[PDB]
From Swiss-Prot, chains C, D, F:
Gene Ontology molecular function, alphabetical: 6,7-dimethyl-8-ribityllumazine synthase activity
Record's GO cellular component terms: cytoplasm; cytosol; riboflavin synthase complex
Binding site for 5-amino-6-(D-ribitylamino)uracil: K4, F53, N54, S87, W88, E89, V111, L112, I113, F144
Catalytic-site annotation from UniProt: H119 (proton donor)
Pathway info: Cofactor biosynthesis; riboflavin biosynthesis; riboflavin from 2-hydroxy-3-oxobutyl phosphate and 5-amino-6-(D-ribitylamino)uracil: step 1/2
Species annotation: Aquifex aeolicus (strain VF5)
Coiled-coil residues: none
Name of this chain's protein: 6,7-dimethyl-8-ribityllumazine synthase
Cross-referenced Pfam families: DMRL_synthase
Family classification: Belongs to the DMRL synthase family.
EC number, as in UniProt: 2.5.1.78
Length: 160, 158, 149, 149, 147, 149, 147
């Protein structure tokens, strides 16, 4: 009975839904940017499709507060499969804490098979009028890696 | 010309109207299929794919400024979701009163999986019952149950 | 050229032309199909249903409707006029005209009774509901030219 | 127990028990015939339809509906659940679910807009009218568990 | 209308870089470099977000309008739409590295205001565009707004 | 065919025809004289003044206006288009076009700024007042196609 | 900065009137008149108030800055200061009648807002400038603000 009540709820509105959704329309956008150019006679507009067929992804999740981390990752995987993706092209890596997220995502982003990287985690405290050191450093690596490896990385953590 | 297409068409009522037809047209295909093995709860949910599906959109010509934004939003919701623009047919009606009759003819065709209703309803400045907005709402609902196909209600009130 | 009978006549003309396109052969592809009716009334057969309350106002609406049919290339011989005593039983008279294969479009003209505005009336709520149910089952367009004084 | 989902599922349980009693032959007599429904769900196959709009509140309603059915002797295996994006097309999906010969009762769960309408709402009436008409035509019970926000 | 101001700044930066890339003066006087407000023969690029669609469309509308009014041609304008406010720096990096683009304009809308504490999301987009301009030696106008 | 630019163009056409009737020779009597303008645009010279705010919406109104001129028999060569930066100074641009003997009718198209509805604004109150004073003194018709967003 | 916008509008009105005053086209196509954004060889005139000196000086600062940045010359700019918000229309009438001035810019600051009823002072300044432009056939930009 417990195995059925957990799947009764829907995972559409969680933060992991749009975090994975943004990566689907970003992998297809880079394909068109580096492809052939336009034919002229009009303004060129580039946008990404929502077809997740033939795309290899990667998900990194923390370990703190597994009652909430597991909620987001389940909703993250549901985005790809419901959009035409396959579970055969999903790689999941778990890290002890949020400090190790940027280093773990660097290894996956350097592989030629991976097309996008999704990072999921939970921040500590946050609701304070003081500078946070562990919270600021995790945003440094993700932004720097994306601009260096030319690969999208999605920031989809939540603060409680 | 490029000025008009620069604006976005995401989030308007035409986007959700076409989005619901994507799930409904795929949910029905799973229902007619073989049932599950058992020993667990069976949950049906339609995927957001749009490849190999044919759609039809009916639009009212009244209030041409607002309708064109909604019509283009529904068209872009199909192509960006994997659909093909060769499988989309479009019909126009003089007003919102002629939408249920036109939507019925498109649904009678075998090669149509969903029907999108797009229109603008004139909002009464004084609060009173409308004898036109009620007929179009009940007309589409009765056709959906009778013809075993889903029709999406995607009109707005000015 | 500005009365409500002009607009109702125009809607019945292009809707009849649009219905023949769907029943005809489809396109060859390679493009997105778009259907729209023209304003040619040649070869079309029309039927007009008019009430009798406010006889002064109805005559203008009926005269305005017949003028639009012949102005857009429609033959005067191919129209049928039926007078109706009360606005309540317009749907039953309109159904008989639309049940024959000769008539292609049916136009309903009438004037409603204005009583208490903020409440709900039953005479006006049934003439519109009956006309809507007739079009969906007979597969024919029926315009709604009924106005309120 | 305190939510409306608990009450909605309970009504569909004993109503299904009432319908199977009418199929059997009548008694010999000597007393007036009274028919009652029991709270036993053994051998009953039920279907649930829920809307995804405002999923914060819908998950609580479906929590009570799925908790009461297992409490009253109903096994989890024979429960079918279908999700819809909006409450507008609740009876469209329920029409196909109720038409199956392996189903007994259909329970619909949804949340509508606030109820301070001026005179009428064009969405809340369609969902209620569709389910009532569907139940009479198919002769199968349908429970209206939709709660206005 | 910050869209008009952001597009105006990028117009006179391309001419300034063209003058620096060109040959110098003949001497005998002070050397002064200036940026004209003529967009003749210039190809630009616009990156826009998809949050608060009402506000963004107003800012994007003035971006193209500023170029064409100042003599620019609509044929040489490239427009890219991005999902959120986080992805502009990585999206602009691929666009700015093309040899047929002389200026890049970034349009977006932030979520929070300025009264709360330090915002991590708002800092990354500003830091990413600053590093790209210095590394690629190409101007990138920063013209987002704060809600 | 339904935008506000279509109606403004039609008004400027028949008003120009009506003005020539008054300047011509009068009737012979024996009846009540009635004057009305036709919808023939041949031999007429028109001038169009358009603003620049909401460039997406203005283009449709300008395109709708020029279509009505050529559809009713008007020569495309005999129209003059003048673009105006702001809606406040439309009257001064319109006066220059109407002060020459070549132009017969002047069409003004613009979009007003919507701020606080129940109060009084001065930008919109002067564009309409200036246009009205120009027509009475120049003896030429000037339409008012300015809409509000 | 409404001072920049008011000066920008007056720049492209002088060219529009010069094209209309000039000879027409050769035909065989639609005749379209446009206003360029080049202030070469144009003489302007600015009228400013002396109420809320902090706000007015900011608006006046952008007025001269807009002209010089768009190719205009500071030599051909005339500036007049007026006591209050009431005297601009009569002051601008004497300035606009000179044959060496092609455009007039009015800068001022109102007292009240827009929530109270009809303001008699605010209406007279707007009505005076509108009548002068039509009577003298010379553009007069209206660019005041409301406190």
């Amino acid at each position: 009975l417990e195995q059925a009540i957990e799947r009764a709820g829907t995972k559409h509105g969680n933060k992991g839904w749009e975090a994975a959704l943004s990566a689907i329309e970003m992998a297809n956008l880079f394909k068109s940017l580096r492809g052939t150019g336009g034919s002229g006679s009009s303004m060129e507009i580039y946008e990404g499709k929502l077809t997740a067929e033939g795309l290899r992804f990667g998900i990194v999740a923390s370990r703190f507060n597994h009652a909430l981390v597991d909620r987001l990752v389940e909703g993250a995987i549901d985005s790809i499969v419901r959009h035409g993706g396959r579970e055969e092209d999903i790689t999941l890596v778990r890290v002890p804490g949020s400090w190790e997220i940027p280093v773990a995502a660097g290894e996956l982003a350097r592989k030629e098979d991976i097309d996008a990287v999704i990072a999921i985690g939970v921040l500590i405290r946050g609701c304070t009028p003081h500078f946070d050191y562990i919270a600021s450093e995790v945003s440094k690596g993700l932004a720097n890696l994306s601009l260096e490896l030319r690969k999208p990385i999605t920031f989809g953590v939540i603060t409680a």
